[PDB]
């Protein structure tokens, strides 16, 4: 089966709700497993406590840099980086879950949730899941962003984990 995971997100201490994500282990098992483990923190590090450091309305909300907290860092459960698994899943619309990178084969822990169809990223960013529930939460996060990516409130993953 495919993992169901969750992120509980707050803005300046105040809760915004939960985002439930399906991880497509059936298509990208290595990428799904990385994200899953980072949600439970079972390796001793993960997304808990880290921020949505970059939010661009009508594009995406980006998170996952739990080492540098500014978009330069993050790491995977396999090491500092791992290859692009495949590009089978596409950026088809809002709610798509996909990996940030710094060029080919530089996946770590940073990721983003699309708020529109970002199909110009097809073949360059590995899509590995989608929002099952809580798109309204994602819209709340989005509303605190700006075209520059800076947020007007600190958007934090207070908790995360696995539902099944
Ligand atoms: O934020 C990053 N890169 C930082 C990063 C990402 C991953 C890792 C590391 C560092 C570290 C640690 C580990 N992994 C490896 O060791 C490598 O070094 N990349 C942007 C991006 O991916 N997207 C997707 C959603 C936002 N974004 C985006 C795309 C197109 C247009 C505008 C934007 Br805005 C970008 C920005 C601009 C162009 C291309 C990519």
Residue numbers in the entry: 2 to 165
In the authors' words:
The mitochondrial matrix protein cyclophilin D (CypD) regulates opening of the MPTP, owing to its potent ability to sensitize the MPTP to calcium and oxidative stress. ,,, CypD belongs to the peptidyl-prolyl cis–trans isomerase (PPIase) cyclophilin (Cyp) family that catalyzes 180° rotation about the C–N linkage of peptide bonds preceding proline and of 17 isoforms of human Cyps, CypD is the only isoform located in the mitochondria. Cyps are so named because of their binding affinity for the lipophilic cyclic peptide cyclosporin A (CsA), which inhibits their PPIase activity and so inhibits CypD-mediated MPTP opening. Here, we report that replacement of carbon with nitrogen in the pyrrolidine headgroup of a series of cyclophilin D inhibitors gives a dramatic enhancement in binding affinity (>40 fold), and prolyl isomerase inhibition (PPIase) activity (>200 fold), which is ascribed to a preorganization of the pyrazolidine amide headgroup. Protein–ligand X-ray crystal structures and NMR and molecular modeling demonstrate the importance of cis-amide geometry within the preorganized conformation, ensuring the ligand headgroup is anchored in the S1′ binding pocket, leading to potent nM PPIase inhibition and binding.
4 Compound 18d complexed to CypD with key interactions highlighted. The RHS interactions between the ligand and protein appear to be preserved from the aniline series. Structural insights from the crystal structure of 18d revealed an expanded S2 pocket that accommodates extra stabilizing interactions, specifically hydrogen bonding and hydrophobic contacts, which likely account for the observed potency enhancement. Additional analogues 18d and 18e, incorporating phenylglycine, were compared to their parent aniline and glycan-glycine counterparts (13 and 18c, respectively). These showed slightly reduced potency, indicating that the benefits of phenylglycine and glycan-fused LHS are not synergistic. However, incorporation of glycan into the phenylglycine analogue 13 to give 18d gave a 2-fold decrease in K d. The situation is different when comparing the molecules with phenylglycine; the aniline compound 13 binds more strongly, with a higher inhibitory effect, than the glycan equivalent, 18d. In this pair, although the enthalpic gain conforms to the other glycan molecules, this is negated by a decrease in ΔS for 18d (unlike an increase in ΔS on binding 13), leading to an overall decrease in ΔG and lower affinity. Notably, compounds 18d and 18f provided significantly superior protection at 300 nM compared to that of CsA, with 18f being the most effective.
